[PDB]
Amino acid sequence: AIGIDLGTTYSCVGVFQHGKVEIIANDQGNRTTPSYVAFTDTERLIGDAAKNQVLNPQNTVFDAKRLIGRKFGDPVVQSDMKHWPFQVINDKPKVQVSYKGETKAFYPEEISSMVLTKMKEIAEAYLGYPVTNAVITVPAYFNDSQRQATKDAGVIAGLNVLRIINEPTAAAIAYGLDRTKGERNVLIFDLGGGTFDVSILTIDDGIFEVKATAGDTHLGGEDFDNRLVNHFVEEFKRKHKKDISQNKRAVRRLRTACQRAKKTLSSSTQASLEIDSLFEGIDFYTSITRARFEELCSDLFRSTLEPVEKALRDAKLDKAQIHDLVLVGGSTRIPKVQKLLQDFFNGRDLNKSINPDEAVAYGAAVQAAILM
Ligand SMILES: [Cl-]
């Protein structure tokens, strides 16, 4: 049995074999896989292949997790639509694309079943035998419709879903927090590529209970990337009196450079950007300090403590009553994010020894093996 983190922008599969969890690399050596499905004139693409060619915006589906289990009427759905390059329709939302010369329509769980099919075959390549049993995780705030449609996606992918479990719960499991006895309050701080969730759980003799959930479904690492891109678009304007914004390729190349610089600023205090012939044949060689990055992202950083306080408020718990702080999602690697959380909790330690990109898949694989 495997554990699958079916994330908004990225998915991760793990397996418990030989006393240990392996997080499994896809074909490209990537241990997380984009939650993207793409339909072309000749083929269906999933994951790494799909996100790359996103050239094909109307037929490259992403963010299915935002749709899954929701009604077309749901304000969330009506609002997310406007920023999707692909069509949506009532059937119940469905995504509509062109595939092999024809218009096709998929429910969100059909799209997510294809991403799960990828995660399944990734696991099977590694294991050297077929996989059928799986635990899939969801945000704690997901309702029963969202959980059912997520489970259905797993079934469609040919999986027997042992359990739908909460992502913060999976994260806790990954750290063995559920096998310590007495009673324990755990705060999961989950800042992903596209979403931010704060969950407080109580663990009692191994039993879980969600006490509070807060966050921002439209706040993540990609927002921090955006701050950097706009900053450098402006820096380029100032320096060269040209606007690269209208050239798609320049923006993309700048964006990937910013993604690289943001990664670098998590382990270094400065990052260099070097782009040959970015625009109008002008090479763009520049740099940014971590401090400059943090400043440009000031509001975003401030946005993260608010759901923390509200979570505490809803759970009727004080700071000191939290026994464990768990870091999930790649962007929790950002130093300023960790400091802001740790400071708020009076210098407490952060559970971060597990790859924050992989903690949820890790936990789901542990749970899968327990249920087996
Ligand atoms: Cl997510």
Side-chain angles (χ1 to χ4, degrees), residues 1-86 88-90 92-180 182-245 247-301 303-372:
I2 65 189
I4 299 179
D5 176 11
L6 180 62
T8 303
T9 66
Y10 279 88
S11 285
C12 188
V13 65
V15 65
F16 190 104
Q17 75 158 12
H18 299 137
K20 72 186 196 319
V21 175
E22 255 277 321
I23 304 296
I24 302 160
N26 63 26
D27 297 321
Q28 293 62 236
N30 301 329
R31 278 146 73 97
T32 63
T33 296
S35 304
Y36 282 60
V37 182
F39 308 82
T40 74
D41 276 329
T42 68
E43 67 197 332
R44 182 181 76 188
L45 298 168
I46 308 161
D48 280 330
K51 184 171 181 186
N52 295 332
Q53 53 90 66
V54 80
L55 307 197
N56 190 23
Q58 288 125 294
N59 306 305
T60 301
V61 184
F62 59 95
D63 270 15
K65 189 169 179 176
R66 300 186 183 277
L67 284 174
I68 202 162
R70 302 185 194 271
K71 283 198 177 67
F72 179 77
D74 189 335
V76 171
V77 173
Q78 288 300 317
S79 165
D80 290 325
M81 283 190 61
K82 318 180 192 308
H83 307 75
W84 290 330
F86 51 76
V88 167
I89 61 201
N90 170 276
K92 290 193 64 67
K94 298 184 75 166
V95 180
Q96 189 169 75
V97 305
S98 185
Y99 181 39
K100 292 180 173 173
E102 287 159 16
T103 311
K104 292 294 184 179
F106 304 106
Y107 291 109
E109 61 264 35
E110 293 180 294
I111 295 294
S112 284
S113 80
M114 298 165 189
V115 167
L116 290 170
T117 289
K118 185 51 162 198
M119 306 315 294
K120 178 187 196 297
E121 290 169 355
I122 286 169
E124 287 173 348
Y126 172 87
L127 289 159
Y129 54 76
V131 184
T132 55
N133 294 319
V135 167
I136 306 172
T137 57
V138 297
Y141 73 88
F142 265 27
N143 60 44
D144 294 337
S145 174
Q146 287 171 305
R147 294 169 192 267
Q148 184 55 44
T150 296
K151 184 184 176 84
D152 296 339
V155 183
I156 298 174
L159 296 174
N160 178 40
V161 184
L162 299 170
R163 190 152 298 165
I164 292 304
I165 73 170
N166 292 323
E167 291 163 18
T169 295
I173 284 173
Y175 279 97
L177 296 194
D178 62 317
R179 296 159 128 178
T180 43
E183 172 176 8
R184 207 164 213 211
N185 305 318
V186 183
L187 185 147
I188 316 299
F189 183 106
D190 182 348
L191 183 60
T195 69
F196 173 54
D197 301 308
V198 172
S199 304
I200 301 179
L201 310 176
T202 297
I203 317 178
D204 195 340
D205 279 79
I207 303 309
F208 287 95
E209 172 190 340
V210 181
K211 295 302 212 52
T213 62
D216 181 352
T217 62
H218 292 94
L219 172 60
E222 286 165 0
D223 296 280
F224 298 89
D225 290 348
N226 291 346
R227 296 299 171 89
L228 288 166
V229 169
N230 297 332
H231 168 255
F232 286 110
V233 169
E234 290 301 310
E235 183 176 305
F236 199 92
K237 294 182 187 172
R238 278 216 53 184
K239 244 271 286 186
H240 295 104
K241 302 298 175 62
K242 288 127 188 305
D243 183 11
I244 74 179
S245 300
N247 190 278
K248 277 176 187 168
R249 181 176 178 246
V251 175
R252 254 133 50 196
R253 295 178 68 214
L254 175 63
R255 173 162 301 271
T256 69
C258 289
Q259 289 165 0
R260 289 194 297 276
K262 183 191 64 183
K263 188 164 301 267
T264 304
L265 294 172
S266 278
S267 62
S268 300
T269 54
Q270 204 189 20
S272 66
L273 283 81
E274 299 164 336
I275 313 165
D276 298 329
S277 189
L278 175 56
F279 186 74
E280 289 296 328
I282 307 169
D283 304 314
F284 195 55
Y285 285 62
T286 189
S287 289
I288 185 152
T289 59
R290 181 185 296 175
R292 187 72 175 108
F293 168 60
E294 288 163 357
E295 171 191 16
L296 293 160
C297 297
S298 297
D299 55 329
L300 298 172
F301 285 141
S303 292
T304 58
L305 287 194
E306 297 162 359
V308 172
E309 298 190 3
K310 172 154 188 300
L312 286 173
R313 233 165 286 139
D314 287 344
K316 300 178 190 305
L317 296 180
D318 193 81
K319 290 181 175 189
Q321 282 183 300
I322 303 301
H323 305 77
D324 301 289
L325 300 173
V326 176
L327 285 191
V328 171
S331 300
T332 63
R333 256 187 269 265
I334 303 173
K336 178 75 182 166
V337 172
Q338 299 189 8
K339 164 181 149 295
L340 282 169
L341 185 58
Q342 183 173 52
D343 280 349
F344 182 86
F345 277 99
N346 300 326
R348 196 95 56 84
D349 288 329
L350 306 183
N351 282 314
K352 68 172 174 180
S353 60
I354 297 182
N355 188 331
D357 290 312
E358 305 173 343
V360 168
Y362 195 109
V366 177
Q367 186 58 14
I370 289 183
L371 295 179
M372 291 296 71

